[PDB]
Amino acid sequence: SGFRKMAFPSGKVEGCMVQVTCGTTTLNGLWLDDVVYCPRHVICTSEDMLNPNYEDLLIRKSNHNFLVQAGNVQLRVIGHSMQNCVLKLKVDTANPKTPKYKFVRIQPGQTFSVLACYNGSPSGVYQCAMRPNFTIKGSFLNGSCGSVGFNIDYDCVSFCYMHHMELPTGVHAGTDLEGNFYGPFVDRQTAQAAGTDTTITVNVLAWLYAAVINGDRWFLNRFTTTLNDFNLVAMKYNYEPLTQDHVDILGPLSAQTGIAVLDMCASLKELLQNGMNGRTILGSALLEDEFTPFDVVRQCS
Amino acid sequence: SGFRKMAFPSGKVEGCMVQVTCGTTTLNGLWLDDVVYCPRHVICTSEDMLNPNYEDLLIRKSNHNFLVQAGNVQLRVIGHSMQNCVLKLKVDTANPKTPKYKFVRIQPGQTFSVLACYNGSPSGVYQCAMRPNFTIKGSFLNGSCGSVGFNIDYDCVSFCYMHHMELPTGVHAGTDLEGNFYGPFVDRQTAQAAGTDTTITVNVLAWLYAAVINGDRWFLNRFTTTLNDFNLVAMKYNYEPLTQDHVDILGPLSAQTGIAVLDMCASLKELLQNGMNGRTILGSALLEDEFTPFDVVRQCS
Ligand SMILES: *[C@H](N)[C@H](C[C@@H]1CCN[C@@H]1O)NC(=O)[C@H](CC(C)C)NC(=O)c1ccc(-c2ccc(F)nc2)cc1
Ligand SMILES: *[C@H](N)[C@H](C[C@@H]1CCN[C@@H]1O)NC(=O)[C@H](CC(C)C)NC(=O)c1ccc(-c2ccc(F)nc2)cc1
């Protein structure tokens, strides 16, 4: 029935996006109850950026220096404070569209949806994975900072990412909603190198299950394997080690398709050492690792 | 700054999704002002499906046989009628969240976002292109029918697609919001073959501009070409003919990047006859034709 990379419905998060202006710098903020969250570099001039002293810059600002707009409505700021790399502005109006929400810090290998925003207004939505080196492959222009990443379950929005910067390789870096960066990055305009990345093995396996469910079965073989024999083969191709917890996380997909997790591991072992030899899987000539086991189950059920 | 396939923010459309139940069949409907739109096969039993007489089935239904629910709220149906392949149910309550909207019929080669829904509730969002053979490559399960496709400009939602069926090849077929199918398909449970498809040439060129904007420039060459010489080369690879209107539609992207449209055509001519030779473009080993010129401009600006 078709497998696509697909984002969460964004309407709950659209209702929380606001514009935050301090001086001549404008970016996005997240308005939940009576607090707006945004990146702290909203308080920099274009000349403070090479190496800012954020605490020093902030002590010169008062509440009125922060212009917050929800659509065509100004929100009066009545308090402000800095939490790691994010700013918290208290406002005199609670957001009447606040969803049920949590702040979470995700693990490498997990995915989320990004609502890309400019001037407090949404531009589009797309899915991203936290790489093992704590970068994401996004699409962000000037003024996108403060756009957020999130998951939904039933009715609860778990925010996990806030955008801060681009790296020289073209990938993106940001913080959780407590303002702590993912990875070893800082919010200043200096060249910063991303770690050496790795392939997310358990996600590749999830994607092979998605392929079988949707008509691509040519790579299945008659073999099984042990977890130890698989990892000895895969480590040469810069795949992260497959743990017993990963096998267990794949368990529900094995039960849905009738293909044992270690049977699929044997198919992946064969694809690594032999290649694809002119064939594709779900239209791709490369193995894809940006879908989690839960992403596949959510889409296929 | 990164190029991604990206969907429109879905919140305006989420506010219009409702569940429509007739007998034991349930699917999705679109609630705008005081009318719900949905696929007419909501009125079939599981046994009517091989070749339904929809007009006959409908004359046996009255208003009360249609259960419409917006969340946990029933909407009382006060009228009903069939327009080609869609049903229109008048309800006694206007949708207080109706956006500014239009119904449009899109052309092959254009794109839109799909909000995939089950039981009136959104599951996810993704981008699709109307193929030259009037199919889309979607992701739809049982009960997804009545999910809609759409574009936004500023504040206006242009609905262009409503989902009805899957074809034996795995691709999807549906109607505009007046109930007219795209392509030569009918809404019955019978095997139906999609036409022979073609590559959307003007979209491939748009995607090459997106590649250059985002760091992939190895395929640019020093040559120009004429529209006629390009088409003589491309027609052997099942690319649709490039028209002067297509060159003009690409004009704004040429002005943004400094690369003349016919210069980019010369690069595409070289890629067709020589291949990619182990290199990729925006991570892909194949040329992609599912982004329009406007999709690239919207994302890159
Ligand atoms: C938020 N509005 C914005 C989003 C950026 C803009 C371009 N694409 C990004 O996603 N954030 C910023 O511009 C950052 C502000 C600092 C954190 C204060 N800066 C950067 O994103 C950035 C920093 C450094 C470089 C760079 C330095 C040296 C070098 F050789 N190459 C790159 C680039 C970008
Ligand atoms: C809407 N809820 C649903 C969406 C379908 C379900 C599976 N994926 C699709 O996107 N629509 C339907 O199920 C259609 C109802 C008819 C229009 C009344 N039917 C189909 O989608 C369908 C029809 C025929 C076949 C088929 C027949 C013969 C054959 F050899 N191979 C396939 C398949 C599906």
Side-chain angles (χ1 to χ4, degrees), chain A residues 1-153 155-301, chain B residues 1-153 155-301:
Chain A
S1 278
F3 193 72
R4 299 290 315 273
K5 184 169 303 199
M6 104 170 50
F8 286 103
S10 59
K12 293 182 174 310
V13 177
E14 295 175 46
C16 310
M17 281 339 279
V18 301
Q19 169 172 227
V20 178
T21 296
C22 184
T24 73
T25 305
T26 300
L27 39 63
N28 306 291
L30 187 66
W31 181 26
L32 301 164
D33 298 324
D34 66 351
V35 179
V36 178
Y37 306 78
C38 72
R40 65 176 173 169
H41 70 68
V42 71
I43 66 181
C44 302
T45 49
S46 209
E47 214 261 0
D48 275 304
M49 295 231 276
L50 271 183
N51 205 352
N53 184 334
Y54 287 105
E55 290 96 335
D56 181 51
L57 292 178
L58 188 57
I59 180 57
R60 284 105 163 61
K61 316 310 181 263
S62 71
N63 291 330
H64 192 77
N65 310 158
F66 293 99
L67 190 47
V68 184
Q69 292 170 104
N72 263 28
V73 177
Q74 176 172 359
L75 285 53
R76 186 169 181 81
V77 172
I78 62 182
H80 67 279
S81 65
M82 182 175 30
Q83 181 178 7
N84 300 305
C85 291
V86 292
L87 273 195
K88 295 191 276 188
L89 312 180
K90 187 155 190 231
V91 292
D92 61 9
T93 302
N95 180 4
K97 302 177 177 189
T98 306
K100 170 166 163 33
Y101 74 93
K102 316 175 208 203
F103 288 171
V104 302
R105 184 171 178 89
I106 57 162
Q107 297 288 327
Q110 317 266 80
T111 58
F112 53 92
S113 301
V114 174
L115 183 62
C117 287
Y118 299 89
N119 302 287
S121 301
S123 182
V125 69
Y126 52 83
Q127 276 287 102
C128 283
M130 195 40 72
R131 305 300 315 174
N133 69 359
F134 298 99
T135 66
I136 64 174
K137 304 173 166 18
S139 174
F140 297 109
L141 300 176
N142 282 322
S144 58
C145 283
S147 299
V148 296
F150 62 100
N151 291 86
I152 312 190
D153 77 350
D155 78 307
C156 182
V157 180
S158 293
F159 297 100
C160 61
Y161 179 86
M162 186 176 253
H163 183 53
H164 292 249
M165 69 178 294
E166 187 168 312
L167 306 183
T169 60
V171 299
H172 298 102
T175 66
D176 61 27
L177 269 295
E178 275 167 341
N180 291 306
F181 260 97
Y182 290 99
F185 307 114
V186 293
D187 50 343
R188 56 177 290 212
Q189 191 182 311
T190 197
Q192 301 177 56
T196 47
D197 208 21
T198 326
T199 294
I200 308 160
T201 305
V202 67
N203 287 3
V204 177
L205 289 158
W207 177 75
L208 292 178
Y209 277 106
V212 176
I213 286 160
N214 283 279
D216 255 332
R217 63 172 200 262
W218 61 265
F219 51 85
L220 297 173
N221 60 32
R222 70 209 182 260
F223 301 134
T224 198
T225 186
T226 70
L227 186 67
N228 183 249
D229 302 333
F230 172 84
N231 282 324
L232 299 176
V233 171
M235 75 139 57
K236 310 183 308 283
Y237 303 96
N238 196 24
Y239 273 57
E240 70 174 33
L242 198 68
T243 72
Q244 185 62 44
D245 279 354
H246 293 145
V247 171
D248 294 352
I249 282 162
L250 289 166
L253 272 172
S254 67
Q256 176 177 341
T257 60
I259 302 163
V261 178
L262 298 171
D263 277 43
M264 195 61 87
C265 287
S267 301
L268 174 52
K269 169 206 289 183
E270 175 158 20
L271 284 169
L272 291 178
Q273 45 199 12
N274 292 334
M276 248 183 269
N277 276 23
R279 298 223 55 171
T280 59
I281 296 173
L282 288 175
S284 172
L286 326 190
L287 302 168
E288 307 230 337
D289 76 342
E290 287 249 344
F291 307 83
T292 70
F294 183 70
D295 292 340
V296 173
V297 171
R298 165 209 155 201
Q299 184 163 167
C300 292
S301 65
Chain B
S1 278
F3 193 72
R4 299 290 315 273
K5 184 169 303 199
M6 104 170 50
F8 286 103
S10 59
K12 293 182 174 310
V13 177
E14 295 175 46
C16 310
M17 281 339 279
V18 301
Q19 169 172 227
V20 178
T21 296
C22 184
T24 73
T25 305
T26 300
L27 39 63
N28 306 291
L30 187 66
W31 181 26
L32 301 164
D33 298 324
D34 66 351
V35 179
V36 178
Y37 306 78
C38 72
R40 65 176 173 169
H41 70 68
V42 71
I43 66 181
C44 302
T45 49
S46 209
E47 214 261 0
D48 275 304
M49 295 231 276
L50 271 183
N51 205 352
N53 184 334
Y54 287 105
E55 290 96 335
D56 181 51
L57 292 178
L58 188 57
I59 180 57
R60 284 105 163 61
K61 316 310 181 263
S62 71
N63 291 330
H64 192 77
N65 310 158
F66 293 99
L67 190 47
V68 184
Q69 292 170 104
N72 263 28
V73 177
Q74 176 172 359
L75 285 53
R76 186 169 181 81
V77 172
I78 62 182
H80 67 279
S81 65
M82 182 175 30
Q83 181 178 7
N84 300 305
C85 291
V86 292
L87 273 195
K88 295 191 276 188
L89 312 180
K90 187 155 190 231
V91 292
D92 61 9
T93 302
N95 180 4
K97 302 177 177 189
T98 306
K100 170 166 163 33
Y101 74 93
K102 316 175 208 203
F103 288 171
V104 302
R105 184 171 178 89
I106 57 162
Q107 297 288 327
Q110 317 266 80
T111 58
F112 53 92
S113 301
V114 174
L115 183 62
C117 287
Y118 299 89
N119 302 287
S121 301
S123 182
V125 69
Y126 52 83
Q127 276 287 102
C128 283
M130 195 40 72
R131 305 300 315 174
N133 69 359
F134 298 99
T135 66
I136 64 174
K137 304 173 166 18
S139 174
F140 297 109
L141 300 176
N142 282 322
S144 58
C145 283
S147 299
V148 296
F150 62 100
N151 291 86
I152 312 190
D153 77 350
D155 78 307
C156 182
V157 180
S158 293
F159 297 100
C160 61
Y161 179 86
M162 186 176 253
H163 183 53
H164 292 249
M165 69 178 294
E166 187 168 312
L167 306 183
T169 60
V171 299
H172 298 102
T175 66
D176 61 27
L177 269 295
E178 275 167 341
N180 291 306
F181 260 97
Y182 290 99
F185 307 114
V186 293
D187 50 343
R188 56 177 290 212
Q189 191 182 311
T190 197
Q192 301 177 56
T196 47
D197 208 21
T198 326
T199 294
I200 308 160
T201 305
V202 67
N203 287 3
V204 177
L205 289 158
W207 177 75
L208 292 178
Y209 277 106
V212 176
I213 286 160
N214 283 279
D216 255 332
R217 63 172 200 262
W218 61 265
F219 51 85
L220 297 173
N221 60 32
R222 70 209 182 260
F223 301 134
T224 198
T225 186
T226 70
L227 186 67
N228 183 249
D229 302 333
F230 172 84
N231 282 324
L232 299 176
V233 171
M235 75 139 57
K236 310 183 308 283
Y237 303 96
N238 196 24
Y239 273 57
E240 70 174 33
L242 198 68
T243 72
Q244 185 62 44
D245 279 354
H246 293 145
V247 171
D248 294 352
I249 282 162
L250 289 166
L253 272 172
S254 67
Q256 176 177 341
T257 60
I259 302 163
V261 178
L262 298 171
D263 277 43
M264 195 61 87
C265 287
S267 301
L268 174 52
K269 169 206 289 183
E270 175 158 20
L271 284 169
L272 291 178
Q273 45 199 12
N274 292 334
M276 248 183 269
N277 276 23
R279 298 223 55 171
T280 59
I281 296 173
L282 288 175
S284 172
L286 326 190
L287 302 168
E288 307 230 337
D289 76 342
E290 287 249 344
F291 307 83
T292 70
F294 183 70
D295 292 340
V296 173
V297 171
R298 165 209 155 201
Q299 184 163 167
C300 292
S301 65

Coordinates of all heavy atoms in Angstrom, one line a residue, chain A residues 5-49:
Chain A
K5 N 8.3 8.6 3.4 CA 8.7 9.4 4.5 C 7.6 10.4 4.9 O 7.2 11.2 4.0 CB 10.0 10.1 4.2 CG 10.6 10.8 5.5 CD 12.0 11.2 5.2 CE 12.9 10.1 4.9 NZ 14.3 10.5 5.1
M6 N 7.1 10.3 6.1 CA 5.9 11.1 6.5 C 6.0 11.7 7.8 O 6.6 11.1 8.8 CB 4.7 10.2 6.3 CG 4.0 9.7 7.5 SD 2.4 8.9 7.1 CE 2.7 7.8 5.7
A7 N 5.6 13.0 7.9 CA 5.7 13.8 9.1 C 4.4 13.8 9.9 O 3.4 13.5 9.3 CB 6.0 15.3 8.7
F8 N 4.5 14.1 11.1 CA 3.4 14.2 12.0 C 2.5 15.4 11.5 O 3.0 16.4 11.0 CB 3.7 14.4 13.4 CG 4.2 13.2 14.1 CD1 5.6 13.0 14.4 CD2 3.3 12.2 14.5 CE1 6.1 11.8 15.0 CE2 3.8 11.0 15.1 CZ 5.2 10.9 15.4
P9 N 1.2 15.3 11.7 CA 0.3 16.5 11.4 C 0.8 17.6 12.3 O 1.0 17.5 13.5 CB -1.1 16.0 11.9 CG -1.0 14.5 12.1 CD 0.5 14.2 12.3
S10 N 1.0 18.8 11.7 CA 1.7 19.9 12.4 C 0.7 20.9 13.1 O 1.3 21.9 13.8 CB 2.6 20.7 11.4 OG 1.8 21.2 10.4
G11 N -0.6 20.7 13.1 CA -1.5 21.8 13.5 C -1.3 22.2 15.0 O -1.4 23.4 15.3
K12 N -1.2 21.2 15.8 CA -0.9 21.5 17.3 C 0.3 22.3 17.5 O 0.3 23.2 18.3 CB -0.8 20.1 18.0 CG -2.1 19.3 18.1 CD -1.8 18.0 18.9 CE -3.1 17.2 19.1 NZ -4.1 18.1 19.6
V13 N 1.4 22.1 16.7 CA 2.6 22.9 16.9 C 2.4 24.3 16.2 O 2.9 25.3 16.7 CB 3.8 22.2 16.4 CG1 5.0 23.0 16.5 CG2 3.9 20.9 17.2
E14 N 1.7 24.4 15.1 CA 1.5 25.7 14.4 C 0.8 26.7 15.4 O 1.1 27.9 15.3 CB 0.6 25.5 13.2 CG 1.1 24.6 12.1 CD 0.1 24.3 11.0 OE1 -0.6 25.3 10.5 OE2 0.1 23.2 10.5
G15 N -0.1 26.2 16.2 CA -0.8 27.0 17.1 C 0.1 27.6 18.2 O -0.4 28.5 19.0
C16 N 1.3 27.2 18.3 CA 2.3 27.7 19.4 C 3.4 28.6 18.8 O 4.2 29.1 19.6 CB 2.9 26.6 20.1 SG 1.8 25.3 20.8
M17 N 3.5 28.7 17.5 CA 4.6 29.5 16.9 C 4.3 31.0 17.0 O 3.2 31.4 16.7 CB 4.7 29.0 15.4 CG 5.4 27.7 15.2 SD 6.5 27.0 16.4 CE 8.0 28.0 16.1
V18 N 5.4 31.7 17.4 CA 5.3 33.2 17.5 C 6.6 33.7 17.0 O 7.7 33.0 16.9 CB 5.1 33.7 19.0 CG1 3.8 33.1 19.5 CG2 6.2 33.3 19.9
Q19 N 6.6 35.0 16.7 CA 7.8 35.8 16.3 C 8.4 36.5 17.5 O 7.7 37.0 18.3 CB 7.4 36.7 15.2 CG 8.3 37.7 14.7 CD 7.8 38.5 13.5 OE1 8.5 38.7 12.5 NE2 6.5 38.9 13.5
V20 N 9.7 36.5 17.6 CA 10.4 37.1 18.7 C 11.5 38.1 18.1 O 12.4 37.6 17.4 CB 11.1 36.1 19.6 CG1 11.9 36.9 20.7 CG2 10.1 35.2 20.3
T21 N 11.4 39.4 18.4 CA 12.3 40.4 17.9 C 13.0 41.1 19.0 O 12.3 41.5 20.0 CB 11.6 41.4 17.0 OG1 11.1 40.7 15.8 CG2 12.6 42.4 16.5
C22 N 14.3 41.2 19.0 CA 15.1 41.9 20.0 C 16.1 42.7 19.2 O 17.1 42.2 18.7 CB 15.8 40.9 20.9 SG 16.7 41.7 22.3
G23 N 15.9 44.0 19.1 CA 16.8 44.9 18.3 C 16.4 44.8 16.9 O 15.3 45.2 16.5
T24 N 17.3 44.3 16.0 CA 17.0 44.1 14.6 C 17.0 42.6 14.3 O 16.7 42.2 13.2 CB 17.9 44.8 13.7 OG1 19.2 44.2 13.8 CG2 18.0 46.3 14.1
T25 N 17.3 41.7 15.3 CA 17.3 40.3 15.1 C 15.9 39.7 15.4 O 15.3 40.0 16.5 CB 18.3 39.6 16.0 OG1 19.6 40.1 15.8 CG2 18.3 38.1 15.8
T26 N 15.3 39.0 14.4 CA 14.1 38.3 14.6 C 14.2 36.8 14.4 O 14.9 36.4 13.4 CB 13.0 38.8 13.5 OG1 12.8 40.3 13.7 CG2 11.7 38.1 13.7
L27 N 13.6 36.0 15.2 CA 13.5 34.6 15.0 C 12.2 34.0 15.5 O 11.3 34.8 15.9 CB 14.8 33.9 15.5 CG 15.4 34.3 16.8 CD1 14.5 34.0 18.0 CD2 16.8 33.6 17.1
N28 N 12.1 32.7 15.6 CA 10.9 32.1 16.1 C 11.0 31.7 17.5 O 12.0 31.4 18.1 CB 10.6 30.8 15.3 CG 10.6 31.0 13.8 OD1 9.7 31.7 13.2 ND2 11.7 30.6 13.1
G29 N 9.8 31.7 18.2 CA 9.6 31.2 19.5 C 8.5 30.3 19.6 O 7.6 30.3 18.8
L30 N 8.5 29.5 20.7 CA 7.5 28.5 21.0 C 6.7 29.0 22.3 O 7.3 29.2 23.3 CB 8.1 27.2 21.3 CG 7.2 26.0 21.5 CD1 6.4 25.7 20.2 CD2 7.9 24.7 21.9
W31 N 5.4 29.2 22.1 CA 4.5 29.8 23.1 C 3.7 28.7 23.8 O 2.7 28.2 23.1 CB 3.7 30.9 22.5 CG 2.7 31.7 23.3 CD1 2.8 31.9 24.7 CD2 1.5 32.4 22.9 NE1 1.8 32.7 25.1 CE2 1.0 33.0 24.1 CE3 0.9 32.5 21.7 CZ2 -0.2 33.7 24.0 CZ3 -0.3 33.2 21.6 CH2 -0.8 33.8 22.8
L32 N 4.0 28.3 25.0 CA 3.2 27.3 25.7 C 2.8 27.9 27.1 O 3.6 28.3 27.9 CB 4.1 26.1 25.9 CG 4.6 25.4 24.7 CD1 5.8 24.4 25.0 CD2 3.5 24.7 23.9
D33 N 1.5 27.8 27.3 CA 0.9 28.5 28.5 C 1.4 29.9 28.4 O 1.3 30.6 27.4 CB 1.3 27.7 29.8 CG 0.7 26.3 29.8 OD1 -0.4 26.1 29.3 OD2 1.4 25.4 30.4
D34 N 2.0 30.5 29.5 CA 2.4 31.9 29.5 C 3.9 32.1 29.4 O 4.4 33.0 29.9 CB 1.8 32.7 30.7 CG 2.4 32.2 32.0 OD1 3.2 31.2 32.1 OD2 2.2 32.9 33.1
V35 N 4.6 31.2 28.7 CA 6.0 31.3 28.5 C 6.3 31.1 27.0 O 5.8 30.2 26.4 CB 6.8 30.3 29.3 CG1 8.3 30.4 29.1 CG2 6.4 30.5 30.8
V36 N 7.2 32.0 26.5 CA 7.8 31.8 25.1 C 9.2 31.3 25.2 O 10.0 31.9 26.0 CB 7.7 33.1 24.3 CG1 8.3 33.0 22.9 CG2 6.2 33.6 24.1
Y37 N 9.5 30.2 24.5 CA 10.9 29.7 24.5 C 11.5 30.1 23.1 O 10.9 29.9 22.1 CB 10.9 28.2 24.6 CG 10.1 27.7 25.9 CD1 8.8 27.7 26.0 CD2 10.9 27.3 27.0 CE1 8.1 27.3 27.2 CE2 10.2 26.9 28.2 CZ 8.8 26.9 28.3 OH 8.2 26.5 29.4
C38 N 12.8 30.5 23.1 CA 13.4 30.8 21.8 C 14.9 30.7 22.0 O 15.4 30.7 23.2 CB 13.0 32.2 21.3 SG 13.7 33.6 22.3
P39 N 15.7 30.7 20.9 CA 17.2 30.6 21.0 C 17.7 31.9 21.6 O 17.2 33.0 21.3 CB 17.6 30.4 19.6 CG 16.4 29.8 18.9 CD 15.3 30.5 19.5
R40 N 18.7 31.8 22.5 CA 19.2 33.0 23.2 C 20.0 33.9 22.2 O 20.1 35.1 22.5 CB 20.1 32.6 24.4 CG 21.4 31.9 24.0 CD 22.2 31.6 25.3 NE 23.3 30.8 25.0 CZ 24.4 30.5 25.8 NH1 24.4 31.0 27.0 NH2 25.4 29.9 25.3
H41 N 20.4 33.5 21.0 CA 21.1 34.4 20.2 C 20.2 35.4 19.5 O 20.7 36.3 18.8 CB 22.0 33.7 19.2 CG 21.3 32.9 18.1 ND1 20.6 33.6 17.1 CD2 21.2 31.6 17.8 CE1 20.1 32.7 16.2 NE2 20.5 31.5 16.7
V42 N 18.9 35.4 19.8 CA 18.1 36.5 19.4 C 18.6 37.8 20.0 O 18.4 38.9 19.4 CB 16.6 36.3 19.9 CG1 16.4 36.4 21.4 CG2 15.7 37.3 19.2
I43 N 19.4 37.8 21.1 CA 19.9 39.0 21.7 C 21.2 39.5 21.2 O 21.7 40.5 21.7 CB 20.0 38.9 23.3 CG1 21.1 37.9 23.6 CG2 18.7 38.5 23.9 CD1 21.3 37.7 25.2
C44 N 21.7 38.9 20.1 CA 23.0 39.3 19.5 C 22.7 40.3 18.3 O 21.8 40.1 17.5 CB 23.8 38.2 19.0 SG 24.2 37.0 20.2
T45 N 23.5 41.3 18.2 CA 23.7 42.0 17.0 C 24.4 41.2 16.0 O 25.0 40.1 16.4 CB 24.4 43.4 17.2 OG1 25.6 43.1 17.9 CG2 23.5 44.4 17.9
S46 N 24.4 41.6 14.7 CA 25.1 40.8 13.7 C 26.6 40.8 14.0 O 27.4 40.0 13.4 CB 24.8 41.4 12.3 OG 24.9 40.4 11.3
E47 N 27.1 41.7 14.9 CA 28.5 41.8 15.2 C 29.0 41.1 16.5 O 30.2 41.0 16.7 CB 28.8 43.3 15.2 CG 30.2 43.8 14.7 CD 31.2 44.0 15.8 OE1 30.8 43.8 17.0 OE2 32.4 44.3 15.5
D48 N 28.0 40.7 17.3 CA 28.3 40.0 18.5 C 28.5 38.5 18.3 O 28.7 37.8 19.3 CB 27.1 40.1 19.5 CG 27.1 41.4 20.3 OD1 28.2 41.6 21.0 OD2 26.1 42.1 20.3
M49 N 28.5 38.0 17.1 CA 28.1 36.6 16.8 C 29.4 35.7 16.9 O 29.2 34.5 17.1 CB 27.4 36.5 15.5 CG 26.1 37.2 15.6 SD 24.7 36.2 15.0 CE 24.8 36.5 13.3

